Subunit: 193 residues, 3 copies
């Protein structure tokens, strides 16, 4: 069949253009750089007593705001106790949610190739309210510890109801004892206009 050396370059330029549109090419309404985390969020656990060794004077602790942050190097996730937890996000716009993305650090950059602190089963809720009127289940999915670090999850047959407040509820993790860790959560959709 056969590809030409210039078709090759156009394939590369195209792939790098996409790679550089936040990788997946979809607007993120949960990106803190636009708008952000409430804190009807789970407690928050430090994934380490290398601390005991111990509080470096410049050191702090990942707030849940970290999940709305694109920085995803091995340090940078938000951890909560056990395999169940939640974060509530106030989006930068009122949108009709069509998808979400979750990512975790690559297996390659992890001790022993284990991402056992990775979220597994999770769900998304719409809170029609700028408040806590018990949320509407938007969808339920499973973060796959194989498959790629970045996974996008599209709502099966969503209404065109709009929300500006959603919940990330995690239900199971990939088996880690103490804690689960969230690197970055994103929300995609169609703006109320």
């Amino acid at each position: 069949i056969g590809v030409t050396e210039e078709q090759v370059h156009h394939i590369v330029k195209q792939a790098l253009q996409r790679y550089s549109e936040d990788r997946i090419g979809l607007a993120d309404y949960a990106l803190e750089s636009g708008g952000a985390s409430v804190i009807s969020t789970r407690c928050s656990e430090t994934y380490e007593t290398k601390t005991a060794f111990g509080i470096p004077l410049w050191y702090h602790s990942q707030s849940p705001r970290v999940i709305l942050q694109p920085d995803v190097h091995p340090g940078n996730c938000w951890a909560f106790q056990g395999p169940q937890g939640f974060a509530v996000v106030r989006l930068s716009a009122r949108i009709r949610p069509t998808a979400v993305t979750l990512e975790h650090v690559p297996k390659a950059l992890s001790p022993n190739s284990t991402i056992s602190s990775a979220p597994k089963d999770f769900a998304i809720f719409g809170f029609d309210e700028d408040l806590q009127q018990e949320g509407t289940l938007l969808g339920k999915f499973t973060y796959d510890q194989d498959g790629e670090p970045i996974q996008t999850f599209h709502f099966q047959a969503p209404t065109m109801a709009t929300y500006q407040v959603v919940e990330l509820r995690i239900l199971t993790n990939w088996g880690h004892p103490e804690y689960t860790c969230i690197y970055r959560f994103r929300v995609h959709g169609e703006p109320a206009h």
Copy 2:
């Protein structure tokens, strides 16, 4: 004609090497990481009262320094009032300016594919002075809202006069009512040696 699978890899390695040299492969003398923004700069507008809702305690406001910062995610630009504004930059070296680069967030990551807060017409001035002796017009161009997010603009027939202080003057925007937004401005050239 035909490409081999190994010629393909060399094309990719080469493209990724370039992609990783700040994408365009040219030194940026306006990169704050080397040297920085004065503030014979326009006022500065907050692109939002999602604030009214309202001052998150960790929250701040984009200084004009943001245009000298490589971080270009949807949040991260500097906004000023209306379609006209300016920023004055003190470069990390005395150089002979041969080009500038401007970028804006990809259409793909923007609400409705609109980058209407994007700069349109703009100009560059040399201030021979570490002061305000009325600037020398270096060049005039137009940021294209199609065409790619990163655009480089080479001076038509520049002198080899050297400057360490330049002005970014924006003249028109792509039609946004309240404000224009600058993601990143860069200055390329030949060092006085």
Copy 3:
């Protein structure tokens, strides 16, 4: 022989997957995001009196912690006096060190294509101690100012002794008068399990 347009895409997706696993695909136990710099480290030099011009109020000075930070834009390295210096790092885990990586800014982004502040000859030491019991030489190498910005250096025939504290000792630089500059140092290995 001949490549197909879809084999081309799989080559690109694969290359971008690797590019995005911190480029080299190996865990970094010296990444501050996991665990960090002691300060049986060399003094620390400011690579500039553009300062005299002078202390911008937001301005600070690169701590040696910067070498454990993935941010490698032209500003972001750690400088010490003359061509000889050292930094001591406490890894995020006790590992058996099999390699190290050093990087410097691309020639392309440097004034005149000179990376003369680049480290040249260097060595790595294991301190079996969470203390200063004179270190065990792990290996000796040379950062090549051609060859690529990111260079990885594998230990010739390492024992399976484990350490959580290593020293980066630099011996020669690429010829710069005042100072040498370190962008990022990484430590790879097999965890004590």
